[PDB]
């Protein structure tokens, strides 16, 4: 999946929605402004955490090379596949790589940034559930890392 030049131009056009002034950088102001226009309400500390994940210069900005790297990579990297698989394993006590559909539903809608019923319905539909009702989450992780 070599990154092509047209794909780069489409990332550039998204990057320019944040950096409307043409300064080549995205600060918490530019990021948070676009987000709130869509009806999101991040906090300042959440905007700083987000920028810090890709800001190698440590000056509180995202530049286009950092933006392009994040967009090209998504979740395809091996670190993402391993950590997501480690998160499922927290809820796999048997150690057999399986989790019950009903147990997945409980964790997704009752912990963390809970999924809505419709979100979790789409998630269980997308996993090829076995007839017992058990989900092989390691093949679920490869579908999100492909």
């Amino acid at each position: 999946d070599q990154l092509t030049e047209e794909q780069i131009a489409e990332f550039k056009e998204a990057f320019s929605l944040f950096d409307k002034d043409g300064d080549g950088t995205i600060t918490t102001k530019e990021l948070g402004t676009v987000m709130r226009s869509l009806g999101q309400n991040p906090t300042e500390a959440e905007l700083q955490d987000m920028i810090n994940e890709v800001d190698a210069d440590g000056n509180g900005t995202i530049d286009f090379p950092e933006f392009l790297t994040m967009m090209a990579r998504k979740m395809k990297d091996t670190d993402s596949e391993e950590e997501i698989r480690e998160a499922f394993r927290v809820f796999d006590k048997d150690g057999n790589g399986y989790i019950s559909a009903a147990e997945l539903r409980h964790v997704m809608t009752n912990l963390g940034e809970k999924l809505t019923d419709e979100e979790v319905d789409e998630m269980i539909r997308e996993a090829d559930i076995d007839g017992d009702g058990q989900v092989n989450y390691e093949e679920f992780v490869q579908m999100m890392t492909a």
Partner: peptide
């Protein structure tokens, strides 16, 4: 943290 990671990935 593990529960939220699966959600952000989904």
């Amino acid at each position: 943290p593990a529960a939220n990671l699966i959600q952000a990935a989904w």
